[PDB]
C-alpha cells in the first residue's frame, strides 16, 4: 500500500510538471510574431506616401 501510494503519487507529480513546462513554449513565438508583423503598419504608411 505505501509502495503503490509512492508510485501513483509520483505519476501525479511528473504529469503536472509536464503541463507546466508546455506553457512557456509560447513566449518566444509571441515575440517573433509581433516583431515580424509590426512592419505592416510601416508598409501601410510607406504605401500612403
Amino acid at each position: 500500500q505505501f509502495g503503490s501510494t509512492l508510485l501513483s503519487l509520483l505519476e501525479r507529480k511528473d504529469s503536472l510538471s509536464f503541463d507546466a513546462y508546455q506553457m512557456i513554449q509560447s513566449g518566444d513565438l509571441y515575440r517573433f510574431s509581433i516583431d515580424l508583423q509590426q512592419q505592416d503598419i510601416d508598409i501601410n504608411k510607406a504605401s500612403l506616401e
Partner: protein, 35 residues
Amino acid sequence: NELRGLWDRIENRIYNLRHNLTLDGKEINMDLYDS
C-alpha cells in the same frame, strides 16, 4: 503697382536662393524612410 510686385518678387527669390536646396521644389532630401 508694378514696382510693388517687382520688389516683393525679388525679395521672395532671394529667400529661395538663400535656402538654395529647394529650387522652390525639394532637390536634396526626398524618399527617405525609417522604423
